[PDB]
């Protein structure tokens, strides 16, 4: 367009993009800043960095860039490269490891009255406190602080476009649900002087994690291992496999600890819920193995070297089985030949006595196993409910 | 320095426009002879099918504007000019991975008084070559570097392979140039063939940028030593350990433990192998084929050990030893397999009862021993059937893998070797 | 119109940003640095690099950019982009990557007397060699070395910024907005000017400003995820002494399974410890110790099982060993009577052999008791000592050992 | 040539590449947007990103770049650097990284009628949501949204590109067989193109290119499904093992070890989104629970096997169910010295008789265990077969639609 | 300084930075190149890349940049941006995947005589022929080749500053030790023409790896597994755990193979020392398992099916136990009743005979175990020494 060509030629002829767009140096540029959230790329719990794809809408008036439409064929709006005109140096104050200012210098829309609309894109990597205490049922509040880097509020004033960020074209995250979002403007003063306000706009987003991936991928196998380590106590000691079952459950828990460390964040600020439940499962399995060793020792108790204490006989043989209602447990040469037959008979007598004592020891061990099976199933249920119920009810 | 005056005359006084082709009339063609020199092969990581290479693009063309009379100046026979001052043919690697189409370092061009311009910029290229996993890790790949001129159509510039002379006859350089001294062989890959071809596509049109092509091919063979040492031999030995479950007596209650722990080790090897290969689905990799076969066979070994243990522990109180089973497993197969006064009356009644009980116990024990012999026979048959299958399968699979040399001649229908030792004609 | 426009067009007219603003020969530009730490992003032990977000404050005087306020309607401060001005080439020297410069080139605040205030933010990845001896109960001592990469001590004079006449000899951390890293906590943060006396006042490396960060790790993740499970699993080896020493006792099963679990933990920790080889980390020491203890206990289980399953046929139980261990530590009638005598004799022989078997079993039990006490003492003492050495690894009370000053505001 | 120099000097004397070419105030520039896919590089599901190597076939008309070839030795077209002419800021809007624009700035083709053609290449990383429910037997629907970042419908009018002999629009992604690499993990089922508007916003218009791609699950098939099937077979087999072997627990719990190892293998390959559970993860969890129940029932069988009258009293209902009822259904169906010597013999006989009765009751308990074990074998075989078959047909009935709907 | 401003204005007024700084085009610029190694960032054995942080010190004389200090207030040195003057295009010839030339265009020092000093920083990624034969006790020698890319020796000549690189400010690696370093200049000619030298300067560094990380992380667990391998032969067969112990040791080695795979380099040029040692450990464990299977089969042989060969009885029962010094092993109805008693006596005959034969088999198995224990301890010790001390004595 020849009209637009002439307009652009005459509109930047004596335009210095170093100078503020104010009629007088005592005035301030009023910039309307609006933030539009396009996508939540990721949340890094370990480094406490939130990555978002945004459009940073900025509006201000530049009196030097106005023209009369009647002199240029009725043109009212033109597009100019953003690097041709003065721009506000908005900086993400809580930038973690990304770009501090806008780097994509897209074209801006210039109105014949000097009103400018600039909406560059950006990737914000902002630092925010991640609270891994109820992980994976955790809610995060991560913010974006924006302000003019080198001007105070008497020279360049920024105000929010609306009280909430624009999430009209937001993409559903698939890992996070956006509970709430708002934008606030702050006035900050210093001991220097109370006539020089410093302005910032903070946008915060309340994010709730969708706890389906972590539940299925971590918590369910832990529940399985807790149940199995409880189950070990129904296995008879005669089948020489109590140690096999218990220690193989421990080995599976170790492999799954490898998996867990692969999956959950490696933070150290606090113990997550999964960390607590994993440690509880580990202690449960270890206690199960120790008590199984104790039971195996009691079951193979030699009657020749050991005699059953009276209190053990009174407790585990007399009273406890009576209260276990659901169980099904019980509540010439002829002289030499004659002497040999007598010897065989008396050896059978001794063997029978020893077998009776050993069977009493085995019965005591079996009753102890019944008690521990009931107790450990109760502990598994109580611990599983207790570790998660507070958070689940909290939601 | 007369070079300053010469360059001022060439570029400033003559009004050299670097955005205009060096042609006297806008119907001629600029011929750009290009060659590729492989500085080193960096990587062919198979997970994302990317070939990283350090190459030096050799460029050559004529520029009638950059001609001068060497006598009119001092005897200047060569100049060095930055590429940003002169017209440069933008030749880009089209099949790149990372978004790097251009050369890495824009070095000076060399200009002769006759207008001959040579340009040798170095580059790091990340081109995409698909991975053929069929014979992994005894495989050879055929990775390609495709260069196109996207700034001009074929009616304006023609790409050609550079030519060289030996005894007065020029021949095209139809290969990637590798300096035998400077080149260091890659840690994993050995280069077998390195042809170069100028490709025309007749289904396109000359007035387009998709009509011409210069492609450099790298037929490289993997060196299978890391995988043979760390992956193949331990898996083979641990797998063959499962055959010992049959030679392990059922009285020693550890047949199942041995076989299942062998299966666990094979699962660990599967975990190791899954990370080494891309996700493609053209074919199952050779090591994947072997892992599948040997895991299936170890599962068969476990099942048959379970069957043997089921047979070994049968008793007359729960099972009946039929005559058919006795004939099959106690007579036929072991031969085939070459296997190896009231008081005294009361006393008399009591001793008669004792004798009867002992006789019944002896009969019970001998029939249990018969069941044990049946189990032993089944073990021997299982070993004789499965161990040869396991050994032969492993041997056949890995000799088929070891018999996978490259075809010794690229471009199957072409009789030319494309070797630097024998240029055409 | 904006008088700033006329003022700036006057100032930058005939202004060469290549020229140091040295007024005359032998005039040295004073450049003052003040580092503000915004975020301690990470300290990657594998790469031995510390990533930080800082706002570096650089102050100097440029006599060419001075103006008389009365001539410009009382304007005493203007903003000029840093790319149009001379800048002291203050860079981070000990960067792992090639990033010497700041990240964002902010405008420079220019005062009417020539004073210039530049506050560019920067993302820095600096070299921090790792002291691996007490990992993960360790504290690191990372430093940020700042110097001019262009001008030497004869041209610029780097100094620490001074506030109210007191030198700011520390990294500034704003107490409210600063967020803890979550794995590292800052104990000391001194700042000082250093000299390389091996050089002269030339070479641009003679003088430097160093900011130190003595940070202590918070090893909660390792304790909950590695240390506690590893200790719990390793302690199981002492239980083998209460299992019976026969088939079905499963001494070897338990001990070797614990050793296999320790191997799994070895793999898990191999992914966390740094690859430097100047010291063995504390956690690596503990894994080696528990693996060696597990091997010894497997050997002892094998020895006990060998002893307890001895038989009068394979070995002879000499009375010396018993004292050492069980001490300090009609023809038809004739045929029938012959058969009865033989039966009695055979039963007697079987009982004798069995009896000597239980003798061997008792010896094995005594060995179990003694070796259990020894092994429990060994494991407990070793674990306590190893994980108590780490607990006493405290940060020094002073940032510099012989320096009495604390270097804090 | 010299005439090219003169023509370029004439064309760009007052030409401003910042100005959109509009004959009259209010005119709209027609921009044709086409796409040529050279390579579908990656569809990383962990980050929900597609990498492609593409050409943008852009064409528009610039009235300022008009000349009469008869006056310039018949120069019909020029190759001008792309930065010297106005171009619409056609960018990929749904990019995952921050790179909106093209990567390679090939120079434009300008014809004497003013028709400008531009075919830049780029490596684009667009963001498409992954439907993780039938993974890895899944088809994905990944789009590429192209529009002018700056100009709206009041300034430019987007259109579809024309074919080689421009007569009708191409409403598809163009694939050139000379330069196109099959991904090897993804098959392109449909590749339509369509223009999209927005009811709320009348100034919005884009050209979207849709790629309907189906995964080839062979890698996952092998590396997860075959071992899972083998482990399920072992879980069934544990019930054929006799309790006297002392090997049931080894088999079942080592099968559990194998399942959790396969879970470790698969952890680093499944996408971490929480909208659904991929069918492979559901199959692993079903196998894990089946193996856990095999462990539980093996413990139950071992407990029943090792019972004796000295510890338990056999209830009537167990005898009725497991000894009388089930086996036919499961096909099992089972002088002072002389007086002293006489007393000793009598005592020995009584001991043998008591031991025989005890052994008979123990055999009853062991038979109950055997019958229960066979019942578990049949039940687990049926359950495992039905579950695996159901999951496999569910996965295999997942096919991309015949009509792309776009 | 106004003097320095005027001087810089005069120096570059007619200065063309594309021309070589020679009075006559037949002359050559002499450039003194020195390399200052600051830090050895990393060595990549698999990809054969060494990354180093260096400074490329370049000195030369530019005749066009002379001035008289008296005419400019006595100024003798100035700092100029390197982009303003002719620079030598030095290229790292053996660059792997970094930058070929200098990318940090820092300022340079210029004297009044035209002498120029330029020390830009750079990150060199060089291609390094890695020898893994003696890994991790390996010494690596690899180089940095530098030269002028587009000029031959008759136009631009480069001379080393010293005989060896400057490691004055070299940070200690913590993984490598600088054994030696030197720099050599080479003249290369081509069949074209012997009047056109092509120069390069090659700096080589001899590095010795510090073998502590790999030792404690790989070799020690291999030593434990090797020691545990032969321990199964002292475990009696009566305890049903020979296979359990040996196969669990094999599983531990297989799991440790994850650590070896993730720690050692994945090159195929040669088998590393610890690769040989681990393959030895694997074959050792597998041999132990096979021979343990054979021993268990021997111990359970039944007299009914197998009869002891005469040579086995001669060797393992009579010969070897004598020469085993370490071991302590030794070297009406009445007629029916009568008939039944006779039957019991003869059955005990048969049982005693069979028990004695099975005892002989068990004794043979035990003797074989003792011999195997001695042999396997000897083999373990000898194999460990042979694998490692051969390289270790050289150090
Ligand atoms: C600044 O200018 C005013 C006139 O506007 C003059 O009176 C004053 O002396 C000047 N200041 C200096 C320091 O010369």
JSON list of N, CA, C and O in Angstrom, two decimals, chain D residues 69-97:
[
{"chain": "D", "resi": 69, "resn": "UNK", "atom": "N", "xyz": [8.12, -8.51, -18.56]},
{"chain": "D", "resi": 69, "resn": "UNK", "atom": "CA", "xyz": [9.35, -9.22, -18.95]},
{"chain": "D", "resi": 69, "resn": "UNK", "atom": "C", "xyz": [9.89, -8.79, -20.30]},
{"chain": "D", "resi": 69, "resn": "UNK", "atom": "O", "xyz": [11.10, -8.90, -20.52]},
{"chain": "D", "resi": 70, "resn": "UNK", "atom": "N", "xyz": [9.04, -8.30, -21.20]},
{"chain": "D", "resi": 70, "resn": "UNK", "atom": "CA", "xyz": [9.52, -7.87, -22.51]},
{"chain": "D", "resi": 70, "resn": "UNK", "atom": "C", "xyz": [10.55, -6.75, -22.39]},
{"chain": "D", "resi": 70, "resn": "UNK", "atom": "O", "xyz": [11.41, -6.60, -23.26]},
{"chain": "D", "resi": 71, "resn": "UNK", "atom": "N", "xyz": [10.48, -5.97, -21.32]},
{"chain": "D", "resi": 71, "resn": "UNK", "atom": "CA", "xyz": [11.42, -4.87, -21.09]},
{"chain": "D", "resi": 71, "resn": "UNK", "atom": "C", "xyz": [12.67, -5.30, -20.35]},
{"chain": "D", "resi": 71, "resn": "UNK", "atom": "O", "xyz": [13.55, -4.46, -20.11]},
{"chain": "D", "resi": 72, "resn": "UNK", "atom": "N", "xyz": [12.79, -6.57, -19.98]},
{"chain": "D", "resi": 72, "resn": "UNK", "atom": "CA", "xyz": [13.93, -7.03, -19.19]},
{"chain": "D", "resi": 72, "resn": "UNK", "atom": "C", "xyz": [14.47, -8.35, -19.72]},
{"chain": "D", "resi": 72, "resn": "UNK", "atom": "O", "xyz": [14.81, -9.26, -18.96]},
{"chain": "D", "resi": 73, "resn": "UNK", "atom": "N", "xyz": [14.56, -8.47, -21.05]},
{"chain": "D", "resi": 73, "resn": "UNK", "atom": "CA", "xyz": [15.06, -9.68, -21.70]},
{"chain": "D", "resi": 73, "resn": "UNK", "atom": "C", "xyz": [14.26, -10.91, -21.29]},
{"chain": "D", "resi": 73, "resn": "UNK", "atom": "O", "xyz": [14.80, -12.00, -21.10]},
{"chain": "D", "resi": 74, "resn": "UNK", "atom": "N", "xyz": [12.95, -10.74, -21.14]},
{"chain": "D", "resi": 74, "resn": "UNK", "atom": "CA", "xyz": [12.07, -11.87, -20.87]},
{"chain": "D", "resi": 74, "resn": "UNK", "atom": "C", "xyz": [12.34, -12.58, -19.57]},
{"chain": "D", "resi": 74, "resn": "UNK", "atom": "O", "xyz": [12.27, -13.82, -19.52]},
{"chain": "D", "resi": 75, "resn": "UNK", "atom": "N", "xyz": [12.64, -11.85, -18.51]},
{"chain": "D", "resi": 75, "resn": "UNK", "atom": "CA", "xyz": [12.78, -12.45, -17.19]},
{"chain": "D", "resi": 75, "resn": "UNK", "atom": "C", "xyz": [11.39, -12.67, -16.62]},
{"chain": "D", "resi": 75, "resn": "UNK", "atom": "O", "xyz": [10.69, -11.71, -16.29]},
{"chain": "D", "resi": 76, "resn": "UNK", "atom": "N", "xyz": [10.98, -13.93, -16.51]},
{"chain": "D", "resi": 76, "resn": "UNK", "atom": "CA", "xyz": [9.63, -14.25, -16.07]},
{"chain": "D", "resi": 76, "resn": "UNK", "atom": "C", "xyz": [9.51, -14.35, -14.56]},
{"chain": "D", "resi": 76, "resn": "UNK", "atom": "O", "xyz": [8.43, -14.12, -14.02]},
{"chain": "D", "resi": 77, "resn": "UNK", "atom": "N", "xyz": [10.60, -14.68, -13.87]},
{"chain": "D", "resi": 77, "resn": "UNK", "atom": "CA", "xyz": [10.55, -14.84, -12.43]},
{"chain": "D", "resi": 77, "resn": "UNK", "atom": "C", "xyz": [11.92, -14.56, -11.84]},
{"chain": "D", "resi": 77, "resn": "UNK", "atom": "O", "xyz": [12.94, -14.57, -12.53]},
{"chain": "D", "resi": 78, "resn": "UNK", "atom": "N", "xyz": [11.92, -14.29, -10.53]},
{"chain": "D", "resi": 78, "resn": "UNK", "atom": "CA", "xyz": [13.13, -13.97, -9.80]},
{"chain": "D", "resi": 78, "resn": "UNK", "atom": "C", "xyz": [13.18, -14.78, -8.51]},
{"chain": "D", "resi": 78, "resn": "UNK", "atom": "O", "xyz": [12.14, -15.13, -7.94]},
{"chain": "D", "resi": 79, "resn": "UNK", "atom": "N", "xyz": [14.39, -15.06, -8.05]},
{"chain": "D", "resi": 79, "resn": "UNK", "atom": "CA", "xyz": [14.62, -15.70, -6.76]},
{"chain": "D", "resi": 79, "resn": "UNK", "atom": "C", "xyz": [15.19, -14.63, -5.83]},
{"chain": "D", "resi": 79, "resn": "UNK", "atom": "O", "xyz": [16.37, -14.29, -5.91]},
{"chain": "D", "resi": 80, "resn": "UNK", "atom": "N", "xyz": [14.34, -14.10, -4.96]},
{"chain": "D", "resi": 80, "resn": "UNK", "atom": "CA", "xyz": [14.68, -12.97, -4.11]},
{"chain": "D", "resi": 80, "resn": "UNK", "atom": "C", "xyz": [14.77, -13.45, -2.67]},
{"chain": "D", "resi": 80, "resn": "UNK", "atom": "O", "xyz": [13.92, -14.24, -2.24]},
{"chain": "D", "resi": 81, "resn": "UNK", "atom": "N", "xyz": [15.77, -13.03, -1.89]},
{"chain": "D", "resi": 81, "resn": "UNK", "atom": "CA", "xyz": [15.83, -13.45, -0.48]},
{"chain": "D", "resi": 81, "resn": "UNK", "atom": "C", "xyz": [14.55, -13.10, 0.26]},
{"chain": "D", "resi": 81, "resn": "UNK", "atom": "O", "xyz": [13.98, -12.03, 0.08]},
{"chain": "D", "resi": 82, "resn": "UNK", "atom": "N", "xyz": [14.11, -14.03, 1.10]},
{"chain": "D", "resi": 82, "resn": "UNK", "atom": "CA", "xyz": [12.80, -13.92, 1.73]},
{"chain": "D", "resi": 82, "resn": "UNK", "atom": "C", "xyz": [12.68, -12.70, 2.64]},
{"chain": "D", "resi": 82, "resn": "UNK", "atom": "O", "xyz": [11.57, -12.25, 2.91]},
{"chain": "D", "resi": 83, "resn": "UNK", "atom": "N", "xyz": [13.80, -12.17, 3.12]},
{"chain": "D", "resi": 83, "resn": "UNK", "atom": "CA", "xyz": [13.76, -11.02, 4.01]},
{"chain": "D", "resi": 83, "resn": "UNK", "atom": "C", "xyz": [13.55, -9.71, 3.27]},
{"chain": "D", "resi": 83, "resn": "UNK", "atom": "O", "xyz": [13.30, -8.69, 3.92]},
{"chain": "D", "resi": 84, "resn": "UNK", "atom": "N", "xyz": [13.65, -9.70, 1.95]},
{"chain": "D", "resi": 84, "resn": "UNK", "atom": "CA", "xyz": [13.52, -8.48, 1.16]},
{"chain": "D", "resi": 84, "resn": "UNK", "atom": "C", "xyz": [12.09, -8.21, 0.71]},
{"chain": "D", "resi": 84, "resn": "UNK", "atom": "O", "xyz": [11.83, -7.16, 0.12]},
{"chain": "D", "resi": 85, "resn": "UNK", "atom": "N", "xyz": [11.16, -9.12, 0.97]},
{"chain": "D", "resi": 85, "resn": "UNK", "atom": "CA", "xyz": [9.77, -8.96, 0.55]},
{"chain": "D", "resi": 85, "resn": "UNK", "atom": "C", "xyz": [8.87, -9.11, 1.76]},
{"chain": "D", "resi": 85, "resn": "UNK", "atom": "O", "xyz": [9.24, -9.71, 2.77]},
{"chain": "D", "resi": 86, "resn": "UNK", "atom": "N", "xyz": [7.67, -8.54, 1.66]},
{"chain": "D", "resi": 86, "resn": "UNK", "atom": "CA", "xyz": [6.66, -8.76, 2.68]},
{"chain": "D", "resi": 86, "resn": "UNK", "atom": "C", "xyz": [6.23, -10.21, 2.67]},
{"chain": "D", "resi": 86, "resn": "UNK", "atom": "O", "xyz": [6.05, -10.82, 1.61]},
{"chain": "D", "resi": 87, "resn": "UNK", "atom": "N", "xyz": [6.06, -10.78, 3.85]},
{"chain": "D", "resi": 87, "resn": "UNK", "atom": "CA", "xyz": [5.52, -12.12, 3.99]},
{"chain": "D", "resi": 87, "resn": "UNK", "atom": "C", "xyz": [4.51, -12.12, 5.12]},
{"chain": "D", "resi": 87, "resn": "UNK", "atom": "O", "xyz": [4.66, -11.37, 6.09]},
{"chain": "D", "resi": 88, "resn": "UNK", "atom": "N", "xyz": [3.47, -12.94, 5.02]},
{"chain": "D", "resi": 88, "resn": "UNK", "atom": "CA", "xyz": [2.57, -13.11, 6.16]},
{"chain": "D", "resi": 88, "resn": "UNK", "atom": "C", "xyz": [3.27, -13.92, 7.24]},
{"chain": "D", "resi": 88, "resn": "UNK", "atom": "O", "xyz": [4.02, -14.85, 6.95]},
{"chain": "D", "resi": 89, "resn": "UNK", "atom": "N", "xyz": [3.03, -13.55, 8.49]},
{"chain": "D", "resi": 89, "resn": "UNK", "atom": "CA", "xyz": [3.71, -14.19, 9.61]},
{"chain": "D", "resi": 89, "resn": "UNK", "atom": "C", "xyz": [3.04, -15.53, 9.92]},
{"chain": "D", "resi": 89, "resn": "UNK", "atom": "O", "xyz": [2.56, -15.78, 11.03]},
{"chain": "D", "resi": 90, "resn": "UNK", "atom": "N", "xyz": [3.02, -16.41, 8.92]},
{"chain": "D", "resi": 90, "resn": "UNK", "atom": "CA", "xyz": [2.42, -17.73, 9.10]},
{"chain": "D", "resi": 90, "resn": "UNK", "atom": "C", "xyz": [3.30, -18.55, 10.03]},
{"chain": "D", "resi": 90, "resn": "UNK", "atom": "O", "xyz": [4.46, -18.85, 9.72]},
{"chain": "D", "resi": 91, "resn": "UNK", "atom": "N", "xyz": [2.75, -18.92, 11.18]},
{"chain": "D", "resi": 91, "resn": "UNK", "atom": "CA", "xyz": [3.49, -19.61, 12.22]},
{"chain": "D", "resi": 91, "resn": "UNK", "atom": "C", "xyz": [2.67, -20.81, 12.69]},
{"chain": "D", "resi": 91, "resn": "UNK", "atom": "O", "xyz": [1.46, -20.89, 12.47]},
{"chain": "D", "resi": 92, "resn": "UNK", "atom": "N", "xyz": [3.35, -21.74, 13.35]},
{"chain": "D", "resi": 92, "resn": "UNK", "atom": "CA", "xyz": [2.70, -22.87, 13.99]},
{"chain": "D", "resi": 92, "resn": "UNK", "atom": "C", "xyz": [2.25, -22.43, 15.37]},
{"chain": "D", "resi": 92, "resn": "UNK", "atom": "O", "xyz": [3.08, -22.16, 16.24]},
{"chain": "D", "resi": 93, "resn": "UNK", "atom": "N", "xyz": [0.94, -22.36, 15.58]},
{"chain": "D", "resi": 93, "resn": "UNK", "atom": "CA", "xyz": [0.43, -21.81, 16.83]},
{"chain": "D", "resi": 93, "resn": "UNK", "atom": "C", "xyz": [0.54, -22.81, 17.98]},
{"chain": "D", "resi": 93, "resn": "UNK", "atom": "O", "xyz": [0.86, -22.42, 19.10]},
{"chain": "D", "resi": 94, "resn": "UNK", "atom": "N", "xyz": [0.26, -24.08, 17.72]},
{"chain": "D", "resi": 94, "resn": "UNK", "atom": "CA", "xyz": [0.27, -25.07, 18.79]},
{"chain": "D", "resi": 94, "resn": "UNK", "atom": "C", "xyz": [1.62, -25.76, 18.91]},
{"chain": "D", "resi": 94, "resn": "UNK", "atom": "O", "xyz": [1.71, -26.99, 18.96]},
{"chain": "D", "resi": 95, "resn": "UNK", "atom": "N", "xyz": [2.68, -24.98, 19.01]},
{"chain": "D", "resi": 95, "resn": "UNK", "atom": "CA", "xyz": [4.01, -25.54, 19.20]},
{"chain": "D", "resi": 95, "resn": "UNK", "atom": "C", "xyz": [4.25, -25.83, 20.67]},
{"chain": "D", "resi": 95, "resn": "UNK", "atom": "O", "xyz": [3.73, -25.15, 21.56]},
{"chain": "D", "resi": 96, "resn": "UNK", "atom": "N", "xyz": [5.02, -26.89, 20.93]},
{"chain": "D", "resi": 96, "resn": "UNK", "atom": "CA", "xyz": [5.29, -27.26, 22.31]},
{"chain": "D", "resi": 96, "resn": "UNK", "atom": "C", "xyz": [6.42, -26.43, 22.89]},
{"chain": "D", "resi": 96, "resn": "UNK", "atom": "O", "xyz": [6.37, -26.03, 24.06]},
{"chain": "D", "resi": 97, "resn": "UNK", "atom": "N", "xyz": [7.44, -26.15, 22.09]},
{"chain": "D", "resi": 97, "resn": "UNK", "atom": "CA", "xyz": [8.50, -25.24, 22.48]},
{"chain": "D", "resi": 97, "resn": "UNK", "atom": "C", "xyz": [8.08, -23.81, 22.10]},
{"chain": "D", "resi": 97, "resn": "UNK", "atom": "O", "xyz": [6.94, -23.56, 21.71]}
]
